[PDB]
Scaffold this motif. Structure first.
Motif, PDB file in Angstrom:
ATOM      1  N   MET A  22       0.738  -1.156   0.037  1.00  0.00           N
ATOM      2  CA  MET A  22      -0.027   0.085  -0.103  1.00  0.00           C
ATOM      3  C   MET A  22       0.652   1.297   0.031  1.00  0.00           C
ATOM      4  O   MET A  22       1.688   1.232   0.781  1.00  0.00           O
ATOM      5  N   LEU A  23       0.736   2.153  -0.987  1.00  0.00           N
ATOM      6  CA  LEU A  23       1.384   3.268  -0.966  1.00  0.00           C
ATOM      7  C   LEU A  23       0.564   4.565  -0.418  1.00  0.00           C
ATOM      8  O   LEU A  23      -0.695   4.451  -0.411  1.00  0.00           O
ATOM      9  N   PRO A  24       1.029   5.528   0.007  1.00  0.00           N
ATOM     10  CA  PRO A  24       0.701   6.784   0.379  1.00  0.00           C
ATOM     11  C   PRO A  24       0.150   7.098  -0.884  1.00  0.00           C
ATOM     12  O   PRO A  24       0.977   7.359  -1.990  1.00  0.00           O
ATOM     13  N   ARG A  25      -1.106   7.807  -0.861  1.00  0.00           N
ATOM     14  CA  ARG A  25      -1.649   8.662  -2.114  1.00  0.00           C
ATOM     15  C   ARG A  25      -0.934   9.425  -2.923  1.00  0.00           C
ATOM     16  O   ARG A  25      -0.571   9.495  -4.176  1.00  0.00           O
ATOM     17  N   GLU A  26      -0.036   9.999  -2.207  1.00  0.00           N
ATOM     18  CA  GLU A  26       1.224  10.985  -2.757  1.00  0.00           C
ATOM     19  C   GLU A  26       2.042  10.286  -3.622  1.00  0.00           C
ATOM     20  O   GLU A  26       1.793  10.776  -4.962  1.00  0.00           O
ATOM     21  N   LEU A  27       2.327   9.257  -3.263  1.00  0.00           N
ATOM     22  CA  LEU A  27       3.581   8.366  -4.070  1.00  0.00           C
ATOM     23  C   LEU A  27       2.826   7.519  -5.075  1.00  0.00           C
ATOM     24  O   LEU A  27       3.399   7.268  -6.439  1.00  0.00           O
ATOM     25  N   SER A  28       1.532   7.221  -4.817  1.00  0.00           N
ATOM     26  CA  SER A  28       0.919   6.472  -5.979  1.00  0.00           C
ATOM     27  C   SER A  28       0.618   7.220  -7.219  1.00  0.00           C
ATOM     28  O   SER A  28       0.641   6.846  -8.425  1.00  0.00           O
ATOM     29  N   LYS A  29       0.847   8.719  -7.176  1.00  0.00           N
ATOM     30  CA  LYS A  29       0.803   9.483  -8.445  1.00  0.00           C
ATOM     31  C   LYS A  29       2.052   9.477  -9.222  1.00  0.00           C
ATOM     32  O   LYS A  29       1.903   9.770 -10.450  1.00  0.00           O
ATOM     33  N   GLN A  30       3.100   8.726  -8.533  1.00  0.00           N
ATOM     34  CA  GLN A  30       4.318   8.409  -9.351  1.00  0.00           C
ATOM     35  C   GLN A  30       4.372   7.151 -10.066  1.00  0.00           C
ATOM     36  O   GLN A  30       5.160   6.597 -10.871  1.00  0.00           O
ATOM     37  N   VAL A  31       3.235   6.178  -9.744  1.00  0.00           N
ATOM     38  CA  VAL A  31       3.306   5.015 -10.346  1.00  0.00           C
ATOM     39  C   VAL A  31       2.960   5.047 -12.017  1.00  0.00           C
ATOM     40  O   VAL A  31       1.881   5.770 -12.118  1.00  0.00           O
ATOM     41  N   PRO A  32       3.739   4.698 -13.019  1.00  0.00           N
ATOM     42  CA  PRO A  32       3.279   4.440 -14.369  1.00  0.00           C
ATOM     43  C   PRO A  32       1.785   3.914 -14.702  1.00  0.00           C
ATOM     44  O   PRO A  32       1.484   2.928 -13.949  1.00  0.00           O
ATOM     45  N   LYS A  33       1.232   4.489 -15.443  1.00  0.00           N
ATOM     46  CA  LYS A  33      -0.083   3.631 -16.012  1.00  0.00           C
ATOM     47  C   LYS A  33      -0.280   3.006 -17.080  1.00  0.00           C
ATOM     48  O   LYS A  33      -1.054   2.305 -17.138  1.00  0.00           O
ATOM     49  N   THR A  34       0.916   2.997 -17.921  1.00  0.00           N
ATOM     50  CA  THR A  34       0.772   2.306 -19.153  1.00  0.00           C
ATOM     51  C   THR A  34       1.635   1.256 -19.246  1.00  0.00           C
ATOM     52  O   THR A  34       1.478   0.372 -20.299  1.00  0.00           O
ATOM     53  N   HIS A  35       2.363   0.709 -18.165  1.00  0.00           N
ATOM     54  CA  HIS A  35       3.184  -0.427 -18.264  1.00  0.00           C
ATOM     55  C   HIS A  35       3.552  -0.874 -16.875  1.00  0.00           C
ATOM     56  O   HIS A  35       3.469   0.257 -15.880  1.00  0.00           O
ATOM     57  N   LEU A  36       3.946  -2.041 -16.755  1.00  0.00           N
ATOM     58  CA  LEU A  36       4.304  -2.598 -15.437  1.00  0.00           C
ATOM     59  C   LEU A  36       5.796  -2.044 -15.192  1.00  0.00           C
ATOM     60  O   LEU A  36       6.344  -1.533 -16.196  1.00  0.00           O
ATOM     61  N   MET A  37       6.174  -2.099 -14.100  1.00  0.00           N
ATOM     62  CA  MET A  37       7.456  -1.662 -13.724  1.00  0.00           C
ATOM     63  C   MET A  37       8.351  -2.740 -13.265  1.00  0.00           C
ATOM     64  O   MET A  37       8.116  -3.729 -12.819  1.00  0.00           O
ATOM     65  N   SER A  38       9.506  -2.123 -13.713  1.00  0.00           N
ATOM     66  CA  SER A  38      11.003  -2.824 -13.406  1.00  0.00           C
ATOM     67  C   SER A  38      11.392  -2.716 -11.806  1.00  0.00           C
ATOM     68  O   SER A  38      10.527  -1.682 -11.143  1.00  0.00           O
ATOM     69  N   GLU A  39      12.074  -3.565 -11.373  1.00  0.00           N
ATOM     70  CA  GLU A  39      12.683  -3.283  -9.867  1.00  0.00           C
ATOM     71  C   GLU A  39      13.168  -2.083  -9.768  1.00  0.00           C
ATOM     72  O   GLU A  39      13.225  -1.442  -8.725  1.00  0.00           O
TER      73      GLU A  39
END
Lengths: 78, 78, 78, 74, 78, 74
Positions: A22-39
């Motif tokens: 679970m991320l703080p809302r603030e930080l989830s704004k940083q998650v890419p929306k178009t692709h899965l993330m690398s480590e």
């Protein structure tokens, strides 16, 4: 109160183990929306996990719900 | 597929009846975050309801969840 | 109160039939935490199902949530 | 200590403001089962939020769910 | 399968004790849709509880969700 | 006709893209119970989404829950 990334307990099936972060809302704004993330990319968010965990699926975004209520007719009330 | 506001079925308790309205994500960006809305303001969003419904509560915002999995050790697999 | 097992309604996708079973807390304390159960083990817990249902995944663990409330300042109440 | 407590965002109705707090499994064992917590009780637990917040409810205990699947005939 | 009633664990707030009861579909077809039930009516459905539990609210109706899936373009797969 | 179908936003994993569709109670009565819907079947129902989407699963049927409360002693 503030910005703690939360790591949930693991669960598993016949082949994998899984967990939610679970991320703080603030930080989830940083998650890419178009692709899965690398480590490399989820480590830049502050997620710290041991070896071999893979961001395999985007979570089902939850609907934005408005809540309304109004008095019942008087004779329907208890 | 697109922008339909969804009105759910009503439910009630001893004194009120209630319902949820689901907004397209786009439109929920228009909902005030600091106060409850007057009928004038939720009608400007496109919400259309009969007489006397009141926006009485903000819904509990849902956590932003990341999903990870990794292979179990081989002898733990089935 | 009481202590029966609840069996959900079956649903399916292109390949499988699925169902959830709900255990009372005392019996859920006898479910293995480290491996999936065989048909002999979940029948011994008292799950009565026909032939061929497979315990395939551990349900994701729910957080332990504390709920807090506090009065709004008067001038923010409605 | 080092314990990850998750603080949800606040929501409010016409009279109150509300927040959920997610505890790790181990710290969960230390919450009173018989009564709600006083402000000194949840401050001793490690919950770091403003004063005035009241522990008002025990959360709905979700059932213990077993997941089964069976292949369809082919 | 089977058809028992499941009784959840009790929880409470400052004023009340609370519990959920889960009905099998055939019995849930005999629950009134237009009013709350008295103790004589929910006992007649077979809910066995001690004195003083009140049927106070109708559970909010869950949507009827269809799930759709489609393959990603090859170059978006991982 | 005039029917509010809610289209959720899409999510994806390593191989597929997914979407949920919320149907009004009445249109729900018209969904086959015995099998999944073909593309002409869900297009005849009023679901207006791109071609290629496959109806792949029946959603988990949530139980029928009765809500009870009892006042604590004072």
């Amino acid at each position: 109160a503030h910005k703690q990334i939360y790591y949930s307990d693991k669960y598993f099936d016949e082949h994998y183990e899984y967990r939610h972060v679970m991320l703080p809302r603030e930080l989830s704004k940083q998650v890419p929306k178009t692709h899965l993330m690398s480590e490399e990319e989820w480590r830049r968010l502050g997620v710290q996990q041991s070896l071999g965990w893979v961001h395999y699926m985007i979570h089902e975004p939850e609907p934005h719900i408005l809540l309304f209520r109004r008095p019942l007719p008087k004779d329907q009330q208890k």
